[PDB]
A paper describes a structure:
A series of rigid connector modules replacing the DARPin capping repeats allow to combine the individual DARPin domains in such a way that their distance and angle can be altered to test different geometries, bringing the binding partners of the DARPins into a defined spatial arrangement. The two helices are not just joined end-to-end, but instead the two domains are made to overlap in such a way that the joining helix is stabilized by contacts with the domain cores along its entire length.
Constructs off7_H09_3G124 (crystallized at pH 4.6) and off7_H12_3G124 (crystallized at pH 5.0) diffracted to 1.9 Å and 2.4 Å resolution, respectively.
Author numbering: 12 to 327
Write the structure that this text describes.
Amino acid sequence: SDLGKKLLEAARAGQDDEVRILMANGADVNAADNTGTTPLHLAAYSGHLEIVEVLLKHGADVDASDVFGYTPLHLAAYWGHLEIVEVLLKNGADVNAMDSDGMTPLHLAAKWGYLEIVEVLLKHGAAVGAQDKFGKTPKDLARDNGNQWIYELLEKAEKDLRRKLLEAARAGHREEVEKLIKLGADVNAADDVGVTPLHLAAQRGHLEIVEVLLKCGADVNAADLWGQTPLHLAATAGHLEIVEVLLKNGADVNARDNIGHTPLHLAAWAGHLEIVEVLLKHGADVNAQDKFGKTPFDLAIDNGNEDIAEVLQKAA
């Protein structure tokens, strides 16, 4: 198309008048190059804020991707055009769009050292844990490119993300956790005392958070400072369903904490009968005795939970 190429060339050169005249004469605002480049791509690439706004007003696709997968936001970040980045976000640009190599706008900003653009992409929900085709994150690219201010900025964002996923698990919000998962969250990340989101989820009974994390790759046998597998914390609080899911995904029945207790101990200590039945079905060792020399039968009789001691002897 004749008018199309002229519009592309006008947006790149920064000729607002020609841009307006060509569109006034029927030039498609979303004209496509042979590589998929649109005039918005070239205006955002060149740093022409006025043209960018003009094109968007006339219906420019804010999320157009060329053959390599770059969007106007990729290009604005690639060249460090803060004002354009903001305008593209105001107009509904996908902050977490990925090009062919897995790079997102945050990757590019972190790679080229555009601190102010990093800050803005975060404020608008940029995925901090995204990994490109080469398994590198924006923080990895800041480190490899010697952008230390951005490195510290992104490291603190990962930490803040780590605490939110702990609260959202301790609170019980699936979709609120799921948005953090899609934001690049490390489900296997723990706090200072080795407590993961799967721990706090299995302990408080905010179910279904348990299933997603295990399907995401959360280590079922993650042990905290006290050697507690999430299966331990679920046995005490008395949440049946969670017990099956963990054992359903390779959890260990004979997992021993620092004290030497297994989920069968903690279920016989508390007084949750229906728990021990499930454990016994999975070869839960009734002979296992902790460092106190006590067996799950000893704790069943110490706390006087007779119904438990009875069934423990039938299976012993």
